[PDB]
Amino acid sequence: SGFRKMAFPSGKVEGCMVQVTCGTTTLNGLWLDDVVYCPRHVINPNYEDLLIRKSNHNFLVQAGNVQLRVIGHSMQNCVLKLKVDTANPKTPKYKFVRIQPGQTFSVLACYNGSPSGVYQCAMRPNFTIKGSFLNGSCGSVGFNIDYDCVSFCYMHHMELPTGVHAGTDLEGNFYGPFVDRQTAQAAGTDTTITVNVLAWLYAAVINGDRWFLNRFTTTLNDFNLVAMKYNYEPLTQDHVDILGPLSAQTGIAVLDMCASLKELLQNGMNGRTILGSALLEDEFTPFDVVRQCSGVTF
Amino acid sequence: SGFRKMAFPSGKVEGCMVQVTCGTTTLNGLWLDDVVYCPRHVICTSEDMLNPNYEDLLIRKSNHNFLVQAGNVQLRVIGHSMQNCVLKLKVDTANPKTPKYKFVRIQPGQTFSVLACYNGSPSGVYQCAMRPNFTIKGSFLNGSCGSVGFNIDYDCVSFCYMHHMELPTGVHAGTDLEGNFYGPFVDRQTAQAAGTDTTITVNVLAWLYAAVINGDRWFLNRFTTTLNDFNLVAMKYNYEPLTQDHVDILGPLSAQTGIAVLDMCASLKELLQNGMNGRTILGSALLEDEFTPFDVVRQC
Ligand SMILES: O=C(Nc1cncc2ccccc12)[C@@H]1CCSc2ccc(Cl)cc21
């Protein structure tokens, strides 16, 4: 029993964190094989013009107490790739994956190439992450672990004026309509990840919290008309299919749980909590719920 | 900016997790140097869990009865001893991945990271606090016994908890790494219940200071309070008494924000009286109590 916001074990990623210094800017790098990936803002910015002026010895890369020597550099979108002479012996089995809004991942927050914390979060529908980062956290990475394979999905680049964070996939493509420069940028109005709230309501049922259940069901269209009113993302037939295993396990049809959610949105919690929360939690995917309520290991 | 419940990076602990099997029972072990630490109840059978005589069950065991597995490698047990509720299995190989470590016993209100494991394989990491009633509100299933709680400070891993059991309310009980249980619990299947839990007041105050550091001030008020008046009110909401030690501990956060501890106590009293009124503090509609004053200074 119990339901916690759980992150993947970060060990396979800790062995990849390095410090990257260029000029006065120090941030984090991801050392995989003989390449160090880091935000290109380490170099009105014409990044082609800025990178051409830099030589390999301008980038000081530090892996623990060992300085790696840079033997090449190239840019791929908003990520700088520093070719190093040494392949990381701790390189795990990995993939670069781009995630969709609503998908969750673990973030290994780093400062000066040293991991300081690990937390679980979700890519918001507005493409920001509500992370916890300070100055020097740039280059910190988001990931998921599948068996023995680390799927890198995020690299931190900046903080928006509202305190939320913006970054790219490992190929340098930003999540969201953001650019890597000091300019007027704002996160769009956020919405609640509906499929994730439903997954969390199923997790509450699996943990013995049933007070919010009711005899009612709803059509997908009627639920979505309610979801639009409360700034909740539309629930698709794909989401309903994805919730299938949890619906079979608890005996509560997805549209039956949708009527519970509709009543919760119109009436509130009434002083009650669900899994120790007075708000509807949306940072657990259906897969996260199954994984935690079954104990899958890595 | 931002405030998350952050766990320590678990890598230094992952390289210590092993599987320990004794008969039909399989649980997790912590392999540090040439010793594997695990709950002693790994030696318990079916008609043993109610009233086990661990000394009697252990004397009947030999080293080869304990199967220890580190990844795909079976470690050879060359000795065994019991220290309180932990079994110490001497192995023939020192863990090359052993980090700099200490065994520390924590007090209620202290937080730590838990590396939840099944079959010696880490599955997740989360943050939690030792409740005032000595239980932890963890996320543990069958086979998670032997999973450990820890903090990392200056490259040193301080092991503070080892998971042993789940109480009937879904809360968890365990020991420090010397085998001493936290709370009035025993590693027996006899009727045991967690005491009434209370809110960790010093942690709620630390979290209110974290909210102020992050720009949220809506809950502040023009009032102050005496420590005694705060404790009389707080106890009525099942909040732990705030001691002068707690007030001293909150000193640095009080100096940083410019809000005296007793002025923040008056905001807390008012929040307990009024509730949040549809508002949130650091993305939460409840008062968070699993961040210590030290965690707040660390993260903010
Ligand atoms: O509680 C125990 N195991 C578990 C530990 N954490 C989470 C669990 C979730 C679900 C089922 C079992 C879980 C064991 C076996 C049951 S009776 C018992 C009595 C005393 C002692 Cl020390 C251990 C145990």
UniProtKB/Swiss-Prot annotation, chain B:
It comes from the Viruses. There is a cross-link at residues 5, 90 (Glycyl lysine isopeptide (Lys-Gly) (interchain with G-Cter in ubiquitin)). Inhibited by pyridone-containing alpha-ketoamides compounds 13a and 13b. In turn, alpha-ketoamide 13b (tert-butyl (1-((S)-1-(((S)-4-(benzylamino)-3,4-dioxo-1-((S)-2-oxopyrrolidin-3-yl)butan-2-yl)amino)-3-cyclopropyl-1-oxopropan-2-yl)-2-oxo-1,2-dihydropyridin-3-yl)carbamate) inhibits SARS-CoV-2 replication in human lung cells. Inhibited ex vivo by michael acceptor inhibitor N3. Inhibited ex vivo by compound 11a and 11b. Residues 1-300 form the Peptidase C30 domain. Signal peptide: none annotated. Changing residue 132 to H: In strain: Omicron/BA.1, Omicron/BA.2, Omicron/BA.2.12.1, Omicron/BA.2.75, Omicron/BA.4, Omicron/BA.5, Omicron/BQ.1.1, Omicron/XBB.1.5, Omicron/EG.5.1. Changing residue 142 to A: Does not affect ability to cleave and inactivate human TRMT1. The active site is at residues 41, 145. 3CL-PRO exists as monomer and homodimer. Only the homodimer shows catalytic activity. Interacts with host FBXO22; this interaction promotes the proteasomal degradation of nsp5. Cleaves the C-terminus of replicase polyprotein at 11 sites. Recognizes substrates containing the core sequence [ILMVF]-Q-|-[SGACN]. Cleaves and inactivates human TRMT1, preventing tRNA guanine(26)-dimethylation of tRNAs. May cleave human NLRP1 in lung epithelial cells, thereby activating the NLRP1 inflammasome pathway. May cleave human GSDMD, triggering alternative GSDME-mediated epithelial cell death upon activation of the NLRP1 inflammasome, which may enhance the release interleukins 1B, 6, 16 and 18. Also able to bind an ADP-ribose-1''-phosphate (ADRP). This is 3C-like proteinase nsp5. It comes from Severe acute respiratory syndrome coronavirus 2. The lineage of its organism: Viruses, Riboviria, Orthornavirae, Pisuviricota, Pisoniviricetes.
